Amino acid sequence: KLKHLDKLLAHCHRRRYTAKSTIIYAGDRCETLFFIIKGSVTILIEDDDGREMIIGYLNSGDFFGELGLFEERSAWVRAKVECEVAEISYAKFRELSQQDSEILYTLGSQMADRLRKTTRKVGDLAFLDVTGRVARTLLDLCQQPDAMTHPDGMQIKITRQEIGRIVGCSREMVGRVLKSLEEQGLVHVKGKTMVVF
Amino acid sequence: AHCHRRRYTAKSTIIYAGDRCETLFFIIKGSVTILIEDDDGREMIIGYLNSGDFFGELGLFEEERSAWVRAKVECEVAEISYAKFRELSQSEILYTLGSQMADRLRKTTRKVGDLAFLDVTGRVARTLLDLCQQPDAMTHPDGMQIKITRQEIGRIVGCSREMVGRVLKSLEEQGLVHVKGKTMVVFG
Ligand SMILES: Nc1ncnc2c1ncn2[C@@H]1O[C@@H]2COP(=O)(O)O[C@H]2[C@H]1O
Ligand SMILES: Nc1ncnc2c1ncn2[C@@H]1O[C@@H]2COP(=O)(O)O[C@H]2[C@H]1O
Ligand SMILES: [Au+]
Ligand SMILES: [Au+]
Ligand SMILES: [Au+]
Ligand SMILES: [Au+]
Ligand SMILES: [Au+]
Ligand SMILES: [Cl-]
Ligand SMILES: [Cl-]
Structure with a gap:
């Protein structure tokens, strides 16, 4: 949330995906960041023989497709409901990180919260x-x-x-x-x- | 720098889960083990961090320590206060820390699929x-x-x-x- 969105999504590239529509495919190498205005997506990965697997869900106010901003798409991002999402290029994000440092904390706060849930996800598969x-x-x-x-x-x-x-x-x-x-x-x-x- | 420098011997615990000391750590030399406990005290190794890696950083944007950090060998580690890191934010250091966090999801998320269905x-x-x-x-x-x-x-x-x-x-x-x-x- 915060006031960083107005500076970030100032050049709106709003897109609307219907339910079940794929937004990100694993293995792609396109430099694009996404922000969810309304809706929810599903994050999918493969197991050891190429079957899909649900990792989690992201909702309104969530960024995704952001792991390439730092030095290939790591997972499938599929819209589970009708999602209103806006694109920002990786180039636009890099410039606005220099106009304000709170966008990296906003992005880092979501990355850290996804680590916690995914690390809890590892243990819940071992001890359950x-x-x-x-x-x-x-x-x-x-x-x-x-x-x-x-x-x-x-x-x-x-x-x-x-x-x-x-x-x-x-x-x-x-x-x-x-x-x-x-x-x-x-x-x-x-x-x-x-x-x- | 300096001050910060602390030396942990092998097998020594550096961070306990549930602690709230808001402090960032940097590994000068050595390697740590990230472990979680089950709810009755059984261990599981999540991963390893090596030289040049930060840890104790998930509260840097808000809380409870998310995992146990144990020294696998003799590790030399440096404090960073959350204030000192935030003050030093001013600027490439936030990309450097995020680059380590982005690799930690990929490896940990890849670990979930290899553990599921087994x-x-x-x-x-x-x-x-x-x-x-x-x-x-x-x-x-x-x-x-x-x-x-x-x-x-x-x-x-x-x-x-x-x-x-x-x-x-x-x-x-x-x-x-x-x-x-x-x-x-x-x-075989
Ligand atoms: N474990 C996870 N939890 C939440 N979101 C994830 C996880 N793994 C991947 N993603 C998201 O899925 C995206 C796939 O492409 P990226 O690697 O560009 O950025 C990724 C993240 O936004
Ligand atoms: N799955 C993981 N992979 C790598 N490092 C982790 C993982 N989970 C927790 N950590 C690190 O262990 C630290 C324990 O305390 P914090 O939650 O402050 O910050 C945590 C991260 O730096
Ligand atoms: Au917008
Ligand atoms: Au068991
Ligand atoms: Au000191
Ligand atoms: Au501490
Ligand atoms: Au089964
Ligand atoms: Cl409830
Ligand atoms: Cl099974």
Whole structure:
């Protein structure tokens, strides 16, 4: 946020991506920074045999495509909802870093917060089994944007095949963790919407 | 400069998770290990930092220390106050620190995918194949020889010394390894 956006996105190159649309492909070598005005994206990487895997989500006020500003695209960035995003060239960012140093702290603050979540992501895969990881992943998507409050808990918009690429198992084997958790009295599975108690 | 200079011996902890001392560190010479604990006190190694690397910098933009930092060898490290670094911001030093942070996501995010979809047996499977990177690996006529303990492997794969020990039992009769005392030979 802050007042750095007015100086940064002064030369708007606003783009609108529909849901499911890919914005960044891994391996590309184009020097472009993105800022999310409204919407949410999905960050995807590959495992060891070339399957895609969800790492996290970025929301409004988030930058992405910024790891090349310092000395190839490291991940896929896909729009999960309708995203309003603006481009800034790496060249424009380099000049405005000299007109103000708070844009590198704004960018560094998001880079540091992504390290924390991703480092927590490494440990949650080592010290948790699949049942516990679908339990945490549900627990993490509440303290995450786009969940309204429910009388008995929270509502989240996620499919089981999305959870399988977050926790590292198949959607069918995840069918239980949602099934077994639903009959214990923690969760609701319905179409595109889950209720966590 | 000066002042800053402190020397940590091998195995010595430099940063504890949960601490709030708002201080930046720079490695003059040596290398550290970044470790996290599970919620009942089991270790896992996240990575290593070497000469020219900063650490203790994630609060520099805001909090609780995010990981344990342990000295792998005798390390010489320098303080930087968050104020001194912020005052010295004035200007290429913010690009230098961000370049180290950008490489830390890539390596750590790449580590997530290699750890996901793997069970404890599978992490010991490559970690033994990964054990070529350790500076204590000898050549074997039929493969590689390394001197490593179960509690050292337990901090790489994130599981107990007993579970790493049985998994190696199953692997020795399957055909990767032969265990002799404190040294195992991995075939192929
Ligand atoms: N672990 C992660 N957490 C959050 N965002 C990421 C992560 N890894 C990559 N990204 C984003 O995905 C982008 C892909 O291209 P870049 O490397 O240019 O910049 C990257 C970041 O914006
Ligand atoms: N995944 C990681 N990779 C590399 N370094 C890390 C990682 N997680 C934490 N650190 C470093 O360890 C430090 C511990 O304290 P801070 O959170 O202040 O800043 C942290 C980073 O400098
Ligand atoms: Au704009
Ligand atoms: Au599985
Ligand atoms: Au001092
Ligand atoms: Au300190
Ligand atoms: Au374990
Ligand atoms: Cl809540
Ligand atoms: Cl599995």
